[PDB]
């Protein structure tokens, strides 16, 4: 009969001098806080119950009240930043870290969960959890010869909490903390549970979202081939973070991008660039745009894998944001590519969709497309085929679009368009 208690009754029980009455009331609070219909978190906080729960976390010889208070506090910490803050202000971080070593698995797991919510609030609470020394006991829980001997839910909660310890920026997690976490993270990235894999990929995607030194920390552990494998996974919750991480990595140096290419990533992009999930297509086209910004041999690898027709396709038809990413990929390709590669791009049919996209209201995409067209015209000049390109552009209706752009609000736009008209359409 710990169901549908009032906050007043919970308070009466917790303020009793009776450990069992306190346990009953704490379980009643846990049940109140574990309902999907507007859990009365703020009422529980206003009642002043957080410090009592925290003190209960330390009652070693009453493991039930440890568990019930840990669960109640976990659900409080799962709410707004102010509610998580109320939990932290009650002294919960060191108590939960001390619980991580509990001989009862459900209590240690609940402490893992609570620390995950706290760390996931933001960079400050993440770093505060780290300062209290959570990483060592967390990783100690995972120091087993074979991860398959752990309970599935326990392992999933550990992975999610570690991922939250890798999450958030301004600042990014401490470098020493990342180095301490990464080996276990790679081990988890090779685990066979789909949720563990998804959360490990999210962690890696966080760690690779930053300067090239962070990307290097990750790539040095040799995870790129496993990331490409997971990029081939059937589960969207795995592919999404895998692709996000690969994109992050190819925002780095040409050597890191080359590690992505060598692992076989481009072979997956025919499907990714046609994926029915809009976000997958957009992220894959963004990754392609940063690969085409690389060296000429890397552009050539893009060509060899047959991805230029897929870029033409996405430019021809896709969500407008994906089309913007595709236009950027084309501009990078044309800015860095050889004359032969640019000619090949034209032979694949880039001109007509590129010109069709010059009717968009977005100014940035117009600038991008005009720069790409200028680069293609420069290649044609180097081949002395500018007249052929001008005729092609005129046949698809692009000359009309550029002439109209000559009188466009933005400045760079009309300047570039007038330059094109004067230089190649006289």
């Amino acid at each position: 009969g710990t169901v549908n208690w009032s906050v007043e009754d919970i308070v009466k029980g917790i303020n009793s001098n009776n450990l069992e009455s306190q346990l009953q009331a704490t379980q009643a609070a846990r049940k109140l806080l574990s309902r999907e219909k507007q859990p009365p978190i703020d009422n529980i906080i206003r009642a002043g119950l957080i410090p009592k729960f925290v003190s209960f976390l330390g009652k070693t010889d009453c493991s039930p009240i440890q568990f019930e208070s840990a669960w109640a506090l976990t659900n409080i910490a799962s709410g707004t930043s102010e509610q998580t803050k109320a939990v932290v202000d009650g002294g919960a971080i060191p108590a939960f870290i001390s619980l991580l070593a509990s001989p009862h698995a459900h209590i240690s797991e609940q402490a893992v969960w609570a620390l995950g919510n706290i760390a996931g609030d933001g960079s400050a609470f993440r770093d505060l959890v780290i300062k209290h020394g959570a990483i060592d006991p967390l990783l100690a829980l995972l120091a087993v010869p074979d991860l398959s001997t752990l309970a599935c839910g326990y392992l999933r909660n550990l992975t999610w909490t570690l991922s939250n310890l890798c999450r958030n920026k301004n600042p990014a997690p401490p470098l020493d903390a990342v180095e301490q976490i990464l080996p276990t993270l790679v081990r988890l990235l090779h685990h066979n549970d789909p949720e563990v894999l998804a959360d490990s990929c999210w962690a890696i995607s966080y760690l690779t979202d930053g300067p090239n030194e962070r990307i290097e920390m990750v790539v040095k552990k040799g995870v790129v081939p496993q990331l490409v494998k997971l990029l081939g996974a059937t589960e969207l919750p795995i592919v999404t973070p895998a692709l996000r991480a690969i994109g992050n990595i190819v925002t780095g140096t040409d050597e890191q991008t080359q590690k992505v290419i060598d692992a076989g990533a481009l072979a997956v992009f025919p499907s990714l660039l046609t994926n029915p999930k809009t976000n997958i297509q957009k992220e894959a086209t963004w990754t392609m745009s940063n690969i085409t910004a690389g060296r000429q041999d890397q552009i050539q690898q893009v060509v060899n894998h047959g991805l230029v027709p897929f870029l033409v396709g996405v430019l021809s038809k896709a969500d407008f944001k994906t089309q913007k990413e595709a236009a950027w990929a084309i501009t990078n390709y044309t800015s860095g590519g050889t004359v032969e590669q640019i000619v090949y791009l034209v032979h694949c049919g880039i001109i007509e969709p590129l010109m069709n996209l010059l009717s968009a209201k977005d100014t940035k995409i117009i600038q991008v497309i005009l720069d790409a067209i200028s680069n293609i015209f420069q290649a044609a000049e180097k081949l002395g085929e500018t007249e052929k390109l001008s005729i092609m552009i005129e046949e698809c209706g692009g000359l009309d679009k550029i002439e109209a752009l000559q009188r466009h609000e933005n400045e760079s736009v009309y300047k570039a368009s007038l330059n094109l008209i004067e230089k190649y359409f006289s």
């Binding site: 574990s34 669960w71 659900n75 709410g79 919510n117 609030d121 994109g247 925002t251 940063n290 910004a293």
Partner: peptide, 11 residues
């Protein structure tokens, strides 16, 4: 050229 560009309750 290159462009750099949670919580869970129980029950």
């Amino acid at each position: 050229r290159k462009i750099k560009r949670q919580k869970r309750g129980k029950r």
